[PDB]
Amino acid sequence: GSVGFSTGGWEGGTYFSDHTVTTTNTRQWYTGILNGHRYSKLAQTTGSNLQAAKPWVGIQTPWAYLNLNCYHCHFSPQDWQRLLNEYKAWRPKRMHVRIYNLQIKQITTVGADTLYQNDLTAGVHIFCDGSHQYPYAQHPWDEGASPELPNEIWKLPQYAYFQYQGDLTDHATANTPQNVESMLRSNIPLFLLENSNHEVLRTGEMTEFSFTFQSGWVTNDRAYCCPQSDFNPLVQTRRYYPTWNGSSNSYSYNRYGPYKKPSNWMPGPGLAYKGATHTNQNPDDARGPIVTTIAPRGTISVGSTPSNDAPNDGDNTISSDGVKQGGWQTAPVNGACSRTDYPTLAFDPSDRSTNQNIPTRNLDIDMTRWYRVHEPVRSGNGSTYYNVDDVWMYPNQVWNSTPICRDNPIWDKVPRTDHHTLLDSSDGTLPMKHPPGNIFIKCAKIPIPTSNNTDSYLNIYVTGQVTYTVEWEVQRYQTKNWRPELRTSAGTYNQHEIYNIGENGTYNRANTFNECMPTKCGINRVL
Amino acid sequence: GSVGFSTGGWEGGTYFSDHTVTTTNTRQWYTGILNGHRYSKLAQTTGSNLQAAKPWVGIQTPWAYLNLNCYHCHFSPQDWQRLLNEYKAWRPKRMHVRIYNLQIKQITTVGADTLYQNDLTAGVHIFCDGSHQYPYAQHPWDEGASPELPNEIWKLPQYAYFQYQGDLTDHATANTPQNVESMLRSNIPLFLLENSNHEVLRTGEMTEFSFTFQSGWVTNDRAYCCPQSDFNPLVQTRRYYPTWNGSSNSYSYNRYGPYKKPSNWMPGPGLAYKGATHTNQNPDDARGPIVTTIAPRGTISVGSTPSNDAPNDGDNTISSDGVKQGGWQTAPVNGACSRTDYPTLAFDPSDRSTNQNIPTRNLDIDMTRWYRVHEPVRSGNGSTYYNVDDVWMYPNQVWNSTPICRDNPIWDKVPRTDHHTLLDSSDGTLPMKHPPGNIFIKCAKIPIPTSNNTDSYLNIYVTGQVTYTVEWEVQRYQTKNWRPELRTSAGTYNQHEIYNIGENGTYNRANTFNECMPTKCGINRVL
Amino acid sequence: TNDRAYCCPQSDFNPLVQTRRYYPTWNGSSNSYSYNRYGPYKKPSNWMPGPGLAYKGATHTNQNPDDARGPIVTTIAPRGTISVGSTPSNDAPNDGDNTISSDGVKQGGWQTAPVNGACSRTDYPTLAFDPSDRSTNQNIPTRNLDIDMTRWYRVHEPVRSGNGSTYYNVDDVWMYPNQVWNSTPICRDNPIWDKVPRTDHHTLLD
Amino acid sequence: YQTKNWRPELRTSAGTYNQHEIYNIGENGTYNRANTFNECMPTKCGINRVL
Amino acid sequence: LTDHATANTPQNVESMLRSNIPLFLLENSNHEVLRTGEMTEFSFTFQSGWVTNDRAYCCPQSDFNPLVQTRRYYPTWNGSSNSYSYNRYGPYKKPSNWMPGPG
Amino acid sequence: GVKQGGWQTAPVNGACSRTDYPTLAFDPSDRSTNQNIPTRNLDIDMTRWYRVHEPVRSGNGSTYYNVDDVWMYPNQVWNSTPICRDNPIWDKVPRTDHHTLLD
């Protein structure tokens, strides 16, 4: 008889050790009924009017889901400081999630007054998709992650997923196969969570989930030198550099100076592009820096026209408007270029922020990450130094990843595909094949009798507690550095009261990326 | 199925034996929702206006806590009488606290009428901090301790804690380091009880806590003589006292009279100061007798100005107003001086007292505690007898502690610091490293669905029973005294009906410190 | 000990709860006291500011590095001996004791510094040092930074005087019961230990 | 140390010092030492204890 | 490197770099001190790829058999019809799946 | 600024044999007085490419674009440069979060 028995306590606190950090967090969560207990088409209405449907079309579900992906979910500002000061590297190992102390209440109107009364026999649907049968649909930077403050109520975000690009229209030429658009539309998936197995829980019940991570490392230490400066000037190099003689049409040689020795190591791959920065209008346009247009041959997308003049030769050229609303954008794409760390990653530390100050990633002091790359080419009497904005993958590229802050997402799901290149994120998330599965939650749909076969349900909502524990594998730094180093310190910040509760419970959050306590500031690594 | 089963009975009564007294008390307690389930800045607005913030700034929490610290919590007036009459000494050994028979009710408005209905699935957060991770914030003399009468309802007091002194402002001179105020403000702690582990209980559940005391003794017997009178006049002393001869510029000697023999034993340390008694206005001013101004070099407090004239030499002198609102006061500081027992300890016997008569400690008949101390110094023809208001710690000081009454606090937490001197309280509480930990209680925060992301919770309150049992180590007196002695007796009091229930349930409480049944009145100890 | 106190023991209470304690007010007409509850935002504390002697020493001149400046200067000499700049004084209080001139105390005495104890006001400038031996640096590190909140700036004993009260600065706070304090901060350039002199008695070692 | 403090704290950091090159070897082997007591890295700055 | 402060940059980055420079003194580690009658030795184990002495006499793209026809066709753009027509690759250049290495 | 401020990576020829020369030149020994400087001009391996062209239909004919930068792309296959007795044996891989293929 667990109506009067709790199914759990409250669990909080972090534990530090040499090889392990364990974070434990409990939140009170709730969800009401979403989308009237039904699945429905979700389509974007925004964007400049064009003779086509808007690109994103999908399904919004009745379900809600748990999002644990961000560091401020797991670490308090204190704990994050201690992680960054005492450890050169960490990665998540295993996560345990308990859902318990469930309460299901009927929302009742007896009059001008709204009543909240237990329905003791009402259930809650809880489903973890761990085999990734359903669309994951988790953008790492989404709001609706577990709130930073343990005392804050967490309203579950609603689950929706992409279905098809609505902008695609049938296009028939001598250069295309027939009926490709209808072929795409016929093949769109529909995912209903009710054709899978899940648990239904009443108020005296609990459920739990365990996940094991496989990921690379987040690395807190930085390089104080680039690989290319890293030689010894007191020793001469045997290497010579050529000088072209226009008279003899040959080369002569001179020893490289001891203070620049040619390196075998390439600057890491980096794409320095801002994207389209020219206007703030139309938040649903694809700004950049990389915009990808998907469309199969035989279909034509927004603002696309076939072009019969070379190089295109029957391919569809896409106007600015077409690329802008039709395409899908990848940002940041800076890679190893530190010049474009800014302003290509900017975020709110929390959801629904009223702060006018937007933290943007301006601080990278790691010295393997490059500002500019130049290819000098002999031209006439002198040489022309060509800035290279696109440094692609090339052998012997060696670089460090961007710094991250407590407000970054922890992981990003690697799309399941035939092939992928090296996995390094420009935003710093850990790419994971098999990230922890979506934990889906919805109130039971309790029908109300109707004579006319209308869909009428009882108005209820579930609240409960969720405890999530992450075991973090972690490595303490060791150094022979004689000097003291930069450390994350509260005294660095222009906002002295940051992460403190103020008048009327206002909680102070970072104005800047530095106040978000970024990694790779303090600890020197030897290359 | 404990919805219909109680988790405990009612436990009351005291048990006396030779070496042990056991008090058992049960109270019905409740708390509603505090501070709207949130943490917020708590700042004092009172005091004379000054160009600075008011000193005390802190955090008021959603939590409530149990306060067992006072004797009238544990002992009935009868039981206290018997303790003081039959025992020379006692100390608390172990305490057991049970919280049970929990009821959690929703407060509902259906109309002009307010309804109280069980929420059977609602929880209660109960947390004991026994490792003193959170601020203790218990002033021994606070109200909100368990009520004296077993039948009285106990409303849990709300927990709040100090954070920083708001009066401190940055002060930069050649004599100070830079940016100390921002350094203080940056380093202020924030304590959220939800990052620790605690129990959540529904109505069919209970919890219990055990504590072990380490303390010195409360001592009921008194000295009938001072150490300095304690000799035998029928025997001559070999000791001589000097007399200065101004003519020969030397000393001559004469045997001490047998009825004052010089003693090796110093009067105990005592600071005789009233504090600032001149006005009753501004209850938040620091009156005395010892006022401590905290402020680091590089900061400047209220009413402070740097003074470049000696002795100060760049130190900040503080005006009366600055000391008055800015400082922190220590009272009583009488120590072994009985002259300043009055009026330096005065209190209400109970919380929210309407009695105009305020018990103040005027009765100390222990003879080791001194009225005045004089240092005579030869001056001219005679000698000048200098009153000494400050007797500091000196070797061979020997003294008895102040008497206490049933309305005193039992213990006081020793602040955790690098160093402390001898622990003797002028108010009589037992200093304890590791006093019993705060038991924190709050109603679960049960969210109400809102579309606009406002914070809206279900209005509930918890009531329960708390049983607390203290085992007291105790010592019976033994004496060869031939004569009968003073004993605590109901017939001593001008109020004959004291501790009786009167018309309409009015409970009579002590008008005077004597009616509070003070210790160290009755039993003679041999020195 | 590396950790610090962010509050003094005397601020450390809960203002949301009233105190049962009252403070006296003297009535000169009735020659008695009346009582009023302490305000919830200053609750009288059982805990004394730690012992502290706020004295600079003799700061007036830089000459004569071998003079005993302070803040505590101890003259040793047994009865039957006379030290530098000492003369017997037959006028009270001295009565045959040797009074010592400034010069005598100055070169003859032995100095104890720092003697600030729990007073943070005199942390400066009573501890100043070179980080290394034979330093050429004109900048002398001196201990100006103490943010520990148990260590006190000033102590006042207010005493009712006439119509108002006089607030007496206390430069000497001696050992007294229920004093609780944290030790001074140290730096990487401090000595680790000091040998306790072997003696019959010593007080608390801080 | 162990703390339940929610907030980050002061820590000893090289970036605090007006002398940026402190404890570094300079020209001709000159070793840079603290000008101030803060540059000597004093204790009891960072960690909060609960009383 | 010199400090540069604009609306587009964070503050005090140069001093931040200069403050964080390492200093390495070999005397804070453990090493051997040897007098004239003493010796010391060290062992190392390599992990590496191979140095390769043999060469390719052909590129991967020439490496086919001309006596066999390829089924593959190559496009030719017709500007009049705006479409492609196809012709079998000649047996002596067969399109290769293998790209020239990065250079 | 680029010239004195930057740090240079050479050789970066990769699989291009055209730029084997003159991008690697050295003395065989230290403090050489020899005016003749060995420079790597001899690569007869046939997987290593001289030029790469992307032809693009332009007007009536096609334009053959020389490609001086061939980046990493799938199905690139190549042999490493020849080495001589005077080359270094190894190079320390910088310790970093990421590296591409090591050649």
Numbering used by the authors:
A (entry chain A), B (entry chain E): 41 to 567
C (entry chain F): 259 to 464
D (entry chain F): 517 to 567
E (entry chain G): 208 to 310
F (entry chain G): 362 to 464
Question: What do the authors report?
Answer:
To expand the structural repertoire of determined capsid structures for the diverse Bocaparvovirus genus, viruses infecting dogs (CnMV), pigs (PBoV1), and rats (RBoV) were selected. The ORFs of these viruses coding for the major capsid protein VP2 were cloned into the pFastBac1 plasmid to enable the production of the virus-like particles (VLPs), using the Bac-to-Bac expression system in insect Sf9 cells. In the icosahedral capsid, the 60 VPs assemble via two-, three-, and fivefold symmetry-related VP interactions, resulting in pores at the fivefold symmetry axes, protrusions surrounding the threefold axes, and depressions at the twofold axes.
The first porcine bocavirus (PBoV) was identified in Swedish pigs in 2009. PBoV is usually associated with diarrhea and upper respiratory tract infections in piglets, but a case study in 2016 associated PBoV with a case of encephalomyelitis in a 6-week-old piglet in Germany. The capsid (VP1) amino acid sequence identity of PBoV1 is 42% and 47% for BPV and HBoV1, respectively. Following cryo-EM data collection, three-dimensional-image reconstruction of the capsids, utilizing 50,866 (CnMV), 98,388 (PBoV1), and 9199 (RBoV) individual capsid images, resulted in a resolution of 2.72, 2.31, and 2.52 Å, respectively. The high resolution of the cryo-EM maps allowed the building of reliable atomic models, starting from amino acids 34, 41, and 42 (VP2 numbering) at the N-terminus for CnMV, PBoV1, and RBoV, respectively. In the case of PBoV1 and RBoV, the cryo-EM maps for the most part also showed densities for the carbonyl groups of the main-chain and densities for a specific rotamer for the individual amino acids, guiding the model building for these viruses. Capsid structures previously determined for the Bocaparvovirus genus showed disperse protrusions surrounding the threefold axis that do not significantly extend radially from the capsid surface. In contrast, the CnMV capsid shows very prominent threefold protrusions, while PBoV1 and RBoV follow the previously described characteristics of the genus. In PBoV1 and RBoV, the shorter VR-III does not cover the entire twofold region, but their loop also advances the twofold axis and restricts the size of the depression. Another feature previously observed for the bocaviruses, with the exception of GBoV1, was the presence of density extending into the interior of the capsid below the fivefold channel. This density was also seen for CnMV, but is absent in the PBoV1 and RBoV capsids.
